[PDB]
Short mmCIF file of N, CA and C in Angstrom, two decimals:
data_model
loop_
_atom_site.label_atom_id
_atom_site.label_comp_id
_atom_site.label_asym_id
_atom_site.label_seq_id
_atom_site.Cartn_x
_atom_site.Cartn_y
_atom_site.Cartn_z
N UNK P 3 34.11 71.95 64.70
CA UNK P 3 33.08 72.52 65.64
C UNK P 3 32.64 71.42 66.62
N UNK P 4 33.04 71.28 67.87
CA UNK P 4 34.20 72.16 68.64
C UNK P 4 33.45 73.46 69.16
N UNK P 5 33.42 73.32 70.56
CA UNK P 5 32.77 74.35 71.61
C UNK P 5 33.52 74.32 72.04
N UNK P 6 33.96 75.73 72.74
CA UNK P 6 34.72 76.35 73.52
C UNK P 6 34.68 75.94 75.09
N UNK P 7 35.06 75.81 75.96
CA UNK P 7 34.72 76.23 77.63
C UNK P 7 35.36 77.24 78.08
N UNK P 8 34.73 78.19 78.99
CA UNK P 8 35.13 79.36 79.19
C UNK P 8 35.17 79.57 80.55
N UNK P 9 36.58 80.19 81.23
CA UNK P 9 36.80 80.54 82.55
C UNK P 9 36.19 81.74 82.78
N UNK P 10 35.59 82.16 83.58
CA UNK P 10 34.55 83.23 84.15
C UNK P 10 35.12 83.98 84.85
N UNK P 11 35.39 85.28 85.30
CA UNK P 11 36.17 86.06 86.70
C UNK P 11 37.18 85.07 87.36
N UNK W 3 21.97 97.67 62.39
CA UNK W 3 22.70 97.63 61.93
C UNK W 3 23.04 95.96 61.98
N UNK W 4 24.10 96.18 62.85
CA UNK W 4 24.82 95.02 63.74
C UNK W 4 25.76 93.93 62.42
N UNK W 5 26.77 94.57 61.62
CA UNK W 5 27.02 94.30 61.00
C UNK W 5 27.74 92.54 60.53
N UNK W 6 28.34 92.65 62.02
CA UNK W 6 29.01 91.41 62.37
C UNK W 6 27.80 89.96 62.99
N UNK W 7 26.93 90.09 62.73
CA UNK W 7 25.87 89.34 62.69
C UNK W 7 25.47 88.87 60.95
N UNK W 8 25.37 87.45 60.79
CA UNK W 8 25.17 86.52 59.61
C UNK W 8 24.18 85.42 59.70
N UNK W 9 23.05 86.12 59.57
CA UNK W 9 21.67 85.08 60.07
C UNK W 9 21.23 84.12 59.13
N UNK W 10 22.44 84.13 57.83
CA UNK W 10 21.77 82.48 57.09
C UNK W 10 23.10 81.49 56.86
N UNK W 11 23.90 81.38 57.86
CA UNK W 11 25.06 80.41 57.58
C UNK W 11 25.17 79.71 58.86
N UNK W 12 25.94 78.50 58.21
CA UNK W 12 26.19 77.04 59.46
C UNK W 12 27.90 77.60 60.07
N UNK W 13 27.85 76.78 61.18
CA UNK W 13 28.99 77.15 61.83
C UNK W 13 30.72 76.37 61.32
N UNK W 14 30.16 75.40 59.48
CA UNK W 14 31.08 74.91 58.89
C UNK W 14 31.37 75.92 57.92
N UNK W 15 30.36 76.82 57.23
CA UNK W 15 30.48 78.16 56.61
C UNK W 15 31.18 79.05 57.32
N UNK W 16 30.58 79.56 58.29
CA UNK W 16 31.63 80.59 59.44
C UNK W 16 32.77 80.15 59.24
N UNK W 17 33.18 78.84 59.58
CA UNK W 17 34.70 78.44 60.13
C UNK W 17 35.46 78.78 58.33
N UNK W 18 34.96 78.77 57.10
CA UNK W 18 35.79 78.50 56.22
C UNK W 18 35.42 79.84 55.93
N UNK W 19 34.45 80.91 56.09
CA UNK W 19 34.29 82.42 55.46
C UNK W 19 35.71 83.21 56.49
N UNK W 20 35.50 83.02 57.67
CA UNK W 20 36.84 83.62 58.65
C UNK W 20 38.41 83.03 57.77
N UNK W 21 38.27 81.81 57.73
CA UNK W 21 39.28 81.39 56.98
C UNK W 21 40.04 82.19 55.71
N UNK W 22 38.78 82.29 55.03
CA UNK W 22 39.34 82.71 53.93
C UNK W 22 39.35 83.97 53.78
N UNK W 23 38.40 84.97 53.97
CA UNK W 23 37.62 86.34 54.29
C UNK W 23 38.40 87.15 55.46
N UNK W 24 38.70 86.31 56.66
CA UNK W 24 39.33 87.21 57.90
C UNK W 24 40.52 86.94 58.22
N UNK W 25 40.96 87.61 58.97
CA UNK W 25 42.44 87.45 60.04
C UNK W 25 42.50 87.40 61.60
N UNK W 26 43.18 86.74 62.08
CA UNK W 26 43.39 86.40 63.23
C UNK W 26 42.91 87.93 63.76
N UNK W 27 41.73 87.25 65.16
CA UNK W 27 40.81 88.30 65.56
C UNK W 27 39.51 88.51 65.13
N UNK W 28 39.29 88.07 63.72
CA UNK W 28 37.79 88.64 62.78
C UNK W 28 36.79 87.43 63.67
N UNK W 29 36.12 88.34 64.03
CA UNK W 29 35.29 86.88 64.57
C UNK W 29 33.54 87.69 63.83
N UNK W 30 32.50 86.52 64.04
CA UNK W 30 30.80 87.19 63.97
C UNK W 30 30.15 86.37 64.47
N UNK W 31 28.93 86.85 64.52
CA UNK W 31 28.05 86.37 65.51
C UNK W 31 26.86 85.45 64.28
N UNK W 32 25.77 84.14 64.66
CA UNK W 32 24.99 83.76 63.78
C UNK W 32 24.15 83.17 65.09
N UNK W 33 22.90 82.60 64.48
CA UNK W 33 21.90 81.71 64.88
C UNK W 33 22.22 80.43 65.39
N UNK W 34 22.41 80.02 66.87
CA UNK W 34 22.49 78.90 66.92
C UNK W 34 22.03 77.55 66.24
N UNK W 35 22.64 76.52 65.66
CA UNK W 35 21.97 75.46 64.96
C UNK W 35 21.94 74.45 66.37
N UNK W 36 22.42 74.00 66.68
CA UNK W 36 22.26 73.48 68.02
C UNK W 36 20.90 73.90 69.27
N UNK W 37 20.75 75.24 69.38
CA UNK W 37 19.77 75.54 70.28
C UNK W 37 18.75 76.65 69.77
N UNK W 38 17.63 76.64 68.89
CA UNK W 38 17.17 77.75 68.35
C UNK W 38 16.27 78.65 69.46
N UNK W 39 16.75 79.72 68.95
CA UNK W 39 16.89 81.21 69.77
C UNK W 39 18.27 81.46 70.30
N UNK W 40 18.79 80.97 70.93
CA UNK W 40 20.39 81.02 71.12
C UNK W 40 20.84 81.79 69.40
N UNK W 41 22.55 82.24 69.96
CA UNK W 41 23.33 82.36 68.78
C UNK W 41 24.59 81.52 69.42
N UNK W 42 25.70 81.98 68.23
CA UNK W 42 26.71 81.51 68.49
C UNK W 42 28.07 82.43 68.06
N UNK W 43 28.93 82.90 68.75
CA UNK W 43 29.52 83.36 68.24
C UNK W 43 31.39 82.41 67.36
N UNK W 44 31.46 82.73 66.61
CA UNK W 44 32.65 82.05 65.42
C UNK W 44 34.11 83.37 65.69
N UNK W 45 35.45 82.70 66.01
CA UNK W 45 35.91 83.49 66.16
C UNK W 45 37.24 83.02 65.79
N UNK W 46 37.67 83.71 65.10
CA UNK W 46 39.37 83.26 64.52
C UNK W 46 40.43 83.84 65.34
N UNK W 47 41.49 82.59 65.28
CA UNK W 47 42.19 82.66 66.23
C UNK W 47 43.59 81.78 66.41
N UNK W 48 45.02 82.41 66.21
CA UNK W 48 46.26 81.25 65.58
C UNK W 48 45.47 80.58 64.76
N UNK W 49 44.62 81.21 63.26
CA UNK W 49 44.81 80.29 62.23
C UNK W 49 43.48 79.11 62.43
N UNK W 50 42.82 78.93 63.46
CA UNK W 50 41.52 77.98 63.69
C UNK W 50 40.43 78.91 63.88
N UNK W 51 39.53 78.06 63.77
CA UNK W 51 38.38 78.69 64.71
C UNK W 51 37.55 78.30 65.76
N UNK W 52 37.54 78.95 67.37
CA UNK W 52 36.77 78.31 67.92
C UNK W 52 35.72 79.15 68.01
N UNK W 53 33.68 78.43 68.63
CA UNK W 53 32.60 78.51 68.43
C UNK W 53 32.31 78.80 70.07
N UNK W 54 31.67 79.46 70.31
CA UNK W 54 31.30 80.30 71.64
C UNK W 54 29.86 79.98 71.60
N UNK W 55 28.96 79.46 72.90
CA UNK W 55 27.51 79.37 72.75
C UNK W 55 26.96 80.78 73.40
N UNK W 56 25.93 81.19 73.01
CA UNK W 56 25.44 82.18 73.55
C UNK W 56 23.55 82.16 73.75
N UNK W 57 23.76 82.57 75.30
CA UNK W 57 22.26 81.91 75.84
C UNK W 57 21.24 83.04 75.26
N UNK W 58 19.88 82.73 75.08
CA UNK W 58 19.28 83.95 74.91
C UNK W 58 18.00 83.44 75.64
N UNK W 59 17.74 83.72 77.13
CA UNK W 59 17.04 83.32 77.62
C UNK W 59 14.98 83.76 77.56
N UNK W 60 15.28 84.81 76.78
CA UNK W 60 13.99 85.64 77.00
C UNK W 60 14.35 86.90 77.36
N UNK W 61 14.84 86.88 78.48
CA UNK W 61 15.15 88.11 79.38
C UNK W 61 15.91 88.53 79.08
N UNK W 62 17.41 88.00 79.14
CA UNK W 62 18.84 88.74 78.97
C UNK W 62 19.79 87.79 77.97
N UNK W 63 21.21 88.00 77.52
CA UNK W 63 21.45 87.19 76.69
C UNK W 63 23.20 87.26 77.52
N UNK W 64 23.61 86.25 77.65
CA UNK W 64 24.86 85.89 78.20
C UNK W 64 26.08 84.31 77.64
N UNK W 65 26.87 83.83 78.10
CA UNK W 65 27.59 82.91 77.34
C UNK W 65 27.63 81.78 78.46
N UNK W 66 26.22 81.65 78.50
CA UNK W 66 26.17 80.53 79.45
C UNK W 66 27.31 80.34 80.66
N UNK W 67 26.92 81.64 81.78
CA UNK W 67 28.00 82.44 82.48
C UNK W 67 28.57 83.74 82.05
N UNK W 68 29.25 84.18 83.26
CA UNK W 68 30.03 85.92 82.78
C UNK W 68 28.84 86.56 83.06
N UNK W 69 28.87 87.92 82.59
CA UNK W 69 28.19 88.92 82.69
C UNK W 69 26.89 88.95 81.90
N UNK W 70 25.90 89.22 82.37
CA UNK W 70 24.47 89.59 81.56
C UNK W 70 23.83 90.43 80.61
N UNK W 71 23.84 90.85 80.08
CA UNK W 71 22.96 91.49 78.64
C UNK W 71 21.95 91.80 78.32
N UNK W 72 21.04 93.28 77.90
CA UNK W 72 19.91 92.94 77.95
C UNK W 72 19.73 92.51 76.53
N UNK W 73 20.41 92.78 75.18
CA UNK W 73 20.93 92.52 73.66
C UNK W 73 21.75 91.70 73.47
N UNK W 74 22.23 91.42 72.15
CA UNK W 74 23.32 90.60 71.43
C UNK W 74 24.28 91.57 71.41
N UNK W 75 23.98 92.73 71.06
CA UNK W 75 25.38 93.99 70.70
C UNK W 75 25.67 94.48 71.90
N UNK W 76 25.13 94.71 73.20
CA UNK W 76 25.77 95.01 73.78
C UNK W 76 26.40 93.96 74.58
N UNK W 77 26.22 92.30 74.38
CA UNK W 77 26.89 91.35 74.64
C UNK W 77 28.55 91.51 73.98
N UNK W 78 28.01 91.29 72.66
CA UNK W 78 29.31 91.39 72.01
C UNK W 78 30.36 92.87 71.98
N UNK W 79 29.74 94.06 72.27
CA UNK W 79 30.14 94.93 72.29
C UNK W 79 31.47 95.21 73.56
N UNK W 80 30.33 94.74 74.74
CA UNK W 80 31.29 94.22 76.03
C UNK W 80 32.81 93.35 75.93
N UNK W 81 32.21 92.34 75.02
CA UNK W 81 33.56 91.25 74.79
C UNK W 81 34.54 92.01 74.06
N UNK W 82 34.28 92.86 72.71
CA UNK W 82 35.26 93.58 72.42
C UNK W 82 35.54 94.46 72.84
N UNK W 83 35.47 95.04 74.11
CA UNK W 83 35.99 96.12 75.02
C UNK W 83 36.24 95.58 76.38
N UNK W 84 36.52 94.45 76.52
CA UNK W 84 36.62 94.06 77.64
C UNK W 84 37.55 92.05 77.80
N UNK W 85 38.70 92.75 76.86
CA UNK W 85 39.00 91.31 76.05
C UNK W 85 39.71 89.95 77.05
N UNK W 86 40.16 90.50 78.51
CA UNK W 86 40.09 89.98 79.18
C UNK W 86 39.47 89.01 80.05
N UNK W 87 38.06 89.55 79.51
CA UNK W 87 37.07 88.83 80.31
C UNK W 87 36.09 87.99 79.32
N UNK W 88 36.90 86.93 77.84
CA UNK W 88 36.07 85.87 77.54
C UNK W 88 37.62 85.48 77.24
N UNK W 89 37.70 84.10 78.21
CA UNK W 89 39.06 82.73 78.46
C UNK W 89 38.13 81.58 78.07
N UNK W 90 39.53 80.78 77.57
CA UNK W 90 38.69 79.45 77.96
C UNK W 90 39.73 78.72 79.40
N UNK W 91 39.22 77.77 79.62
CA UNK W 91 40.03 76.50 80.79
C UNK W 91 41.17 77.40 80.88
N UNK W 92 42.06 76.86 79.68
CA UNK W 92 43.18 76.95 79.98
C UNK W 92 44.00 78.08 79.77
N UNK W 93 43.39 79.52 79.96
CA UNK W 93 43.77 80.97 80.32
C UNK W 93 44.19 81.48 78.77
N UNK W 94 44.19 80.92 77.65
CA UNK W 94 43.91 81.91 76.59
C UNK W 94 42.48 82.38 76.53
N UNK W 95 42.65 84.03 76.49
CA UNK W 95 41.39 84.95 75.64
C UNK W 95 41.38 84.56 74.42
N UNK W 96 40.10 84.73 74.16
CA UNK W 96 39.63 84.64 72.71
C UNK W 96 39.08 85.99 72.43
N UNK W 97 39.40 86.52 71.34
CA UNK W 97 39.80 88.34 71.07
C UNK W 97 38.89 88.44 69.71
N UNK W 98 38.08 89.02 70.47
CA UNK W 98 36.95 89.47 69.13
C UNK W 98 37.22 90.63 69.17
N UNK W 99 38.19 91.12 67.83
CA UNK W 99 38.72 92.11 67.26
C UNK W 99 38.15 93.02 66.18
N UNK W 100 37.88 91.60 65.40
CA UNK W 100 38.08 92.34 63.59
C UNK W 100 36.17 91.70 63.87
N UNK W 101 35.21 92.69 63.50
CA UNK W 101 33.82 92.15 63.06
C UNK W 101 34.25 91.80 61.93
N UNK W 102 33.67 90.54 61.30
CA UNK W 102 33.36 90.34 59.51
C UNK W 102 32.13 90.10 59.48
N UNK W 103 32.01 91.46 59.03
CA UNK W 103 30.53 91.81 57.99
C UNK W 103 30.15 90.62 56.97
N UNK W 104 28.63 90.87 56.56
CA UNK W 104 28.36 89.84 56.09
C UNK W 104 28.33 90.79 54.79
#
């Protein structure tokens, strides 16, 4: 753990 | 209801209950330990698990970005009907499929 990043539209 | 919600476990519990308990896809939602009021969602995936932050501002509840919410379920409800639209960087979705109930 370890977070994600996340692409949006 | 909100079955796929687990309001007394750490996100080292999540990662080994999906493990052992779910299959690629089972993901649930818990209490942020990092930011209280926030959650977090835990989601299995090729065999790991990655951890999703989720804002809960007062007002609306979103993934720090994307689309807005006025709930948690219809946050998460969205993501599993709409599986295209939670990526990370590098263009894999992360597919909240399977709820695991607590």
């Amino acid at each position: 753990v370890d977070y994600g990043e996340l692409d949006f539209q | 209801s909100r079955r796929w919600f687990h309001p007394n476990i750490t996100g080292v519990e999540a990662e080994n209950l999906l493990l052992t308990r779910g299959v690629d896809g089972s993901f649930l939602a818990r209490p942020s330990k990092s930011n209280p009021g926030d959650f977090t969602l835990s989601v299995r995936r090729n065999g790991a698990v990655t951890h999703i932050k989720i804002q809960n501002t007062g007002d609306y509840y979103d993934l720090y970005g994307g689309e807005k919410f006025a709930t948690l379920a219809e946050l998460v409800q969205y993501y599993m009907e709409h599986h295209g639209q939670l990526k990370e960087k590098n263009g894999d979705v992360i597919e909240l499929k399977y709820p695991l109930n607590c």
